[PDB]
Amino acid sequence: LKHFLNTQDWSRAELDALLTQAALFKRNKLGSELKGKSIALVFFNPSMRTRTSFELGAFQLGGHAVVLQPGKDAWPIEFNLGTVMDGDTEEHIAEVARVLGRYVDLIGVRAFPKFVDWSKDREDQVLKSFAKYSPVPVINMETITHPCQELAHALALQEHFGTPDLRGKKYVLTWTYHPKPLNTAVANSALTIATRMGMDVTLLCPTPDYILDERYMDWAAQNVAESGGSLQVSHDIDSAYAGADVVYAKSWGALPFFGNWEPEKPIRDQYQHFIVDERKMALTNNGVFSHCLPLRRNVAATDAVMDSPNCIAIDEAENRLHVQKAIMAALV
Amino acid sequence: LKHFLNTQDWSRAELDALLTQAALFKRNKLGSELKGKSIALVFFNPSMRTRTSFELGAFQLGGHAVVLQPGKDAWPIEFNLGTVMDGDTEEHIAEVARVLGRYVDLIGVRAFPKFVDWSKDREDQVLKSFAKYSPVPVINMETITHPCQELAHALALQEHFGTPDLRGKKYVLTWTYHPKPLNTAVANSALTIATRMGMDVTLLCPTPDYILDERYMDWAAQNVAESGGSLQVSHDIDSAYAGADVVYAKSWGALPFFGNWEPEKPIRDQYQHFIVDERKMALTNNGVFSHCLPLRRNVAATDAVMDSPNCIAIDEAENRLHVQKAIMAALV
Amino acid sequence: LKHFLNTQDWSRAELDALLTQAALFKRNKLGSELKGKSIALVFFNPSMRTRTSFELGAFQLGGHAVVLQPGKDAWPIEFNLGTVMDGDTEEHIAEVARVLGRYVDLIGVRAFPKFVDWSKDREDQVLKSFAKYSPVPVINMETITHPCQELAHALALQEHFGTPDLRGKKYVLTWTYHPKPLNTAVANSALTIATRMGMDVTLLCPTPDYILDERYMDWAAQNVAESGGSLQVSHDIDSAYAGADVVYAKSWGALPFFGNWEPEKPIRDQYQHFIVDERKMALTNNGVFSHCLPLRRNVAATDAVMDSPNCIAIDEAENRLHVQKAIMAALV
Numbered sequence A, B, C: 001l002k003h004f005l006n007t008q009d010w011s012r013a014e015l016d017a018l019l020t021q022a023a024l025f026k027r028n029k030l031g032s033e034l035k036g037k038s039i040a041l042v043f044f045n046p047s048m049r050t051r052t053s054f055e056l057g058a059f060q061l062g063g064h065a066v067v068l069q070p071g072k073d074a075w076p077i078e079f080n081l082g083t084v085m086d087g088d089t090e091e092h093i094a095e096v097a098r099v100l101g102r103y104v105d106l107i108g109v110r111a112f113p114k115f116v117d118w119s120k121d122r123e124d125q126v127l128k129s130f131a132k133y134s135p136v137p138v139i140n141m142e143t144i145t146h147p148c149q150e151l152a153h154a155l156a157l158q159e160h161f162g163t164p165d166l167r168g169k170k171y172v173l174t175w176t177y178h179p180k181p182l183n184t185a186v187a188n189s190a191l192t193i194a195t196r197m198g199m200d201v202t203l204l205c206p207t208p209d210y211i212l213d214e215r216y217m218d219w220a221a222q223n224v225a226e227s228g229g230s231l232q233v234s235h236d237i238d239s240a241y242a243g244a245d246v247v248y249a250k251s252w253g254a255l256p257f258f259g260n261w262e263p264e265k266p267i268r269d270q271y272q273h274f275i276v277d278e279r280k281m282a283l284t285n286n287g288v289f290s291h292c293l294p295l296r297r298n299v300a301a302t303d304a305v306m307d308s309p310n311c312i313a314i315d316e317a318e319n320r321l322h323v324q325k326a327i328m329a330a331l332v
């Protein structure tokens, strides 16, 4: 059974086919690829674009999406095995996935880390549990990686440069400020797809404490070796932005501080100058800027950068709809 | 780009066309006016009829509605410009409206005042922000005015009297009791459409403190001069109801008490006799009674009045479905 | 007007027709029985299967389901008559049911007891109020009985044994452990349908305090006399399971303790050995096990029993979809 858990699990040819089908759907939005079919969209965290784009995508392809929010409308779910369920959780994923598998044709799941222990969050227990117990394809709607974002992002870049071949472009994945410590998912994914695409990638962040999990630094290293791009870590803003073709920002909490955020607060707070502004974007080679959204203006990026013609964030957001339809069609 | 923010923005001919299309849809509910199209229904406050009627209306016309609740499922939204978003809001309406504009064909928004400062609430910031940043038509699902209610109400009256011409009827918009200070939206709209329809309107309320915002008293004055009706304010129950053809009740908080509700409580509490009962309705010319709903029985109106054959509230509620379909069809 | 409030209200022939149509729909899922029609699914409590199956069922039959959650999105509702609504509730069911009746073709409602007073909960006020004021058919999505579950359960048993005739099988409805006192609805319904099907039913529970409401013990007694089965109450595990053909477990709070749960806690806690495990299932005649779900593993039933090939809970859950489509089709 094929699932869409990570682009890293798919061959380059398969990913190219997806992006091309995405472009095709963007030109002809209505179809019958999901006629009479359905997808269960399970959300354990907030969402506006993911929920909306999947729901509409199912509709446009003749199917129907059922939105569920365990703990809100649906019952809270247990993922640990062999435990005595006498706590808050009402039922086990074993039953949940099998039941939904008797109803829908696809299952999407969004589940951010709990931020108490990275050793546990990095295991990707929720997504893996769904893939294990579900008799139907599972789609990652963002857990510790965000593959749907990767493809929406990739497509937006290919459209902007007018070519599927991004090899040679200088890509800067930069950490940016946010009052709270957030998920590394988007950064992990950006690093993954940018290298898989063969670009010259620089991970820019305040300190070594903000370097991404080794798993992704390794995926990237492997992708570079296979695509022909390059990877490097930098803590210097001016040199990183220098001559960049693409700048993608996202804020995330330092991994070593999971379960202990009080001390990383004063740290991130002394780096709010990492905000993407006009000055930094001026150091780029007329590069484009993007963000996965939601974005806090004048914190993560200034109003000027957001409203600049070089910002393609709205296009990337739109592409979530198109690439996801390509994914659902491929899995059904 | 044309939006449906207020009936006051539309010409009488356009409004008549809407009401007529509403009557047409009421006779033939299924259509293809929205085939393959979608509408995002953004709710910042509770709703049963508005959510249900729009959702079903989209379905019956071949489209699909996506229901969003910022702060609940979707992310909380910032509307102020140039602010540093380091608070509760996650993203700006600038991005939200542009993103949704890449997904849906129409955007509906419901956002009641915050009740802390009428100077801010009366600016209609949320609705205006959506209309400004959205590349697609925006529909007011109730902010400080409730135009969809206006048309459902108007249609119900025309059906009841068997004619589109309501000129000459005595219309009584009366404040009624409620334990809490509420939105003036429905009253502002009733005053607006009743005068635009050319009826003899009397705004009945406990004290001068409950008179509606000047903006609407002026719209009404202008509508009367153009339609041939009349407008007057009254604090005397018996004389207001006398010979009335239509009685529309709604409770709202006194505008001068915004941000300071503790003192207006003992005030409204000494006027719970404004409740619409049989005695008052007996002073009318066999007039009809209606309310936008939700209605608290034996507080806003007695059981007898609600169950009287002269109450058309259920018909008005039904008409929300029909007039809204006419609105969506016109804007698409 | 015909509603689906309880299987007890329907003749055996009608119930057989429903189950057969359910089997038919299971073979041919897509249809036009609800083309252009809609159903309002009103939930006053959590749900995953009921919400999902009804929503998808409406879709597969060409209709649309509108999901409402009073107090969450829709306004809170009052059910008592003649009361002065100056409390938490915003509107009365009288208006709610009549309004929805102008929008949808069917209304489903889920409302668990409040657990404060069984004298009030057993009156089934919410379901009865909807049936009284609604101009369209009402479907019980679980209140104090769960008829939709009954049919999904019955169908699953008929499929398992390969025959519609279950007369002669030993059916064991057993109470099982749960940290909290729950609704008796599922047990009341299991007792009702198992006897209506003519099986030899044994209600197994810790003490006389856990015997179901007389209303259902009487329905069962009447069903046995008409179907040819049998009914008996037992507080002895080993003898009850002995030679059983079917074992259905559910935990519920002792009725005499409504409004006073502190003391029934130490009681249920001394009976956690009622958990369905391999030992007990070994005493059965290679019997099947099922549960309505959600189920807490290693509390209500062990992992081994849940994963045993004799567990048909997933099949029963799937059947909720099929029997409900048969119900909606019959009522429309």
Ligand SMILES: CC(=O)N[C@@H](CCCNC(=O)CP(=O)(O)O)C(=O)O
Pocket: A046, A047, A048, A049, A050, A051, A142, A146, A149, A182, A183, A184, A185, A186, A292, A293, A294, B075, B090
């Ligand atoms: C602030 C916050 O927690 N952010 C998330 C955004 C994920 C990417 N964003 C999306 O997928 C867009 P939507 O579907 O509207 O959430 C994160 O940090 O990973």
Ligand SMILES: CC(=O)N[C@@H](CCCNC(=O)CP(=O)(O)O)C(=O)O
Pocket: B046, B047, B048, B049, B050, B051, B142, B146, B149, B182, B183, B184, B185, B186, B292, B293, B294, C075, C090
């Ligand atoms: C109590 C309360 O806050 N009332 C709102 C009702 C608005 C009109 N009512 C509607 O549009 C009906 P629905 O879509 O079900 O809300 C107000 O006072 O403005």
Ligand SMILES: CC(=O)N[C@@H](CCCNC(=O)CP(=O)(O)O)C(=O)O
Pocket: A075, A090, C046, C047, C048, C049, C050, C051, C142, C146, C149, C182, C183, C184, C185, C186, C292, C293, C294
């Ligand atoms: C723990 C709890 O409160 N349980 C409910 C389950 C009802 C039957 N279960 C269903 O109908 C399945 P779903 O639609 O997913 O709820 C009860 O005790 O009655």
